């Protein structure tokens, strides 16, 4: 397809293109801003333990209050644009829960190695 060519496609269909968007005085300001933009999201992935991955499963259970939709209703019946709007009020909450879960995992793996 092309850059954002999948934006109107279903969330499941769009997943094949993740790499397409993963890549990519005023001129200096534009360059610095692009770096800050990139690092903002990479910083979250590093904290979540998801660095280096396009798709990263976590240990955080889905809370049905965020959405009551079935997997077919989400993956085969939605665009990512629509999905972001549905959970726009819960996105930061989810992010914090992922971070808490990762830190506990890092601690538990350390303790396992201490025992072994």
């Amino acid at each position, epitope marked *: 397809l092309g850059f954002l060519g999948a934006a109107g496609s*279903t969330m*499941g*269909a769009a997943s094949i293109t993740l790499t397409v968007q993963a890549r990519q005085i005023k001129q200096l300001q534009a360059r610095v801003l692009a770096v800050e933009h990139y690092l903002r999201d990479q910083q979250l992935l590093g904290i979540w333990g998801c660095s280096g991955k396009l798709i990263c499963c976590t240990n955080v259970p889905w809370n049905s209050s965020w959405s009551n939709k079935s997997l*077919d209703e989400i*993956w*085969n*019946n*939605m665009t990512w644009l*629509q999905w972001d709007k549905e959970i726009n009020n819960y996105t930061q909450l989810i992010y914090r829960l992922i971070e808490e879960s990762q830190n506990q995992q890092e601690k538990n793996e350390k303790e396992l190695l201490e025992l072994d």
Partner: nanobody, 130 residues
Framework: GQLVQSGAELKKPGASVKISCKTS????????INWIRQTAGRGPEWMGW????????????????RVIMTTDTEVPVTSFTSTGAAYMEIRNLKFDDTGTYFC????????????????WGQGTLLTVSS
């Protein structure tokens, strides 16, 4: 999401009839438009379906020589909803073609069940008399 159909109409045998199906509250192009017939002597019958997006259509073998399907270009209301209409024409009506005709839309945008008639219009009667 709602579908609205043309009201009931009386025809003579051999006459053609055209039935509209106005749509609102969802993107017209996102889902297949199905047509289903119900007659007391036959039960429910599939009349086939037409995609509003590609224009592709799949008529059941019984209706391939008598039924023509077409759609209007959608007119957007919101970034995620639109209005538009589907039409079906039936040629050479017979007394066996009487009964309720229904408009329906596909369940999903993708997956094996995408075209299933999830949402139905109220349906309207077709009558044939000498």
């Amino acid at each position: 999401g709602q579908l609205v159909q043309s009201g009931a109409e009386l025809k003579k045998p051999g006459a053609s009839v055209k039935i509209s199906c106005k749509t609102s509250g969802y993107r017209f192009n996102f889902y297949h438009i199905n047509w289903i017939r119900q007659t007391a002597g036959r039960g429910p019958e599939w009349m086939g379906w037409i995609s509003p997006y590609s224009g592709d259509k799949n008529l059941a073998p019984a209706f391939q020589d008598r039924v023509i399907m077409t759609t209007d270009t959608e007119v957007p209301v919101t970034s995620f909803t639109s209005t538009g209409a589907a039409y079906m024409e039936i040629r050479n009506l017979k007394f066996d073609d009487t009964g309720t005709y229904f408009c329906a839309k596909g369940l999903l945008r993708d997956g094996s069940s995408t075209w299933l008639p999830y949402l139905w219009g109220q349906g309207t009667l077709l009558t044939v008399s000498s």
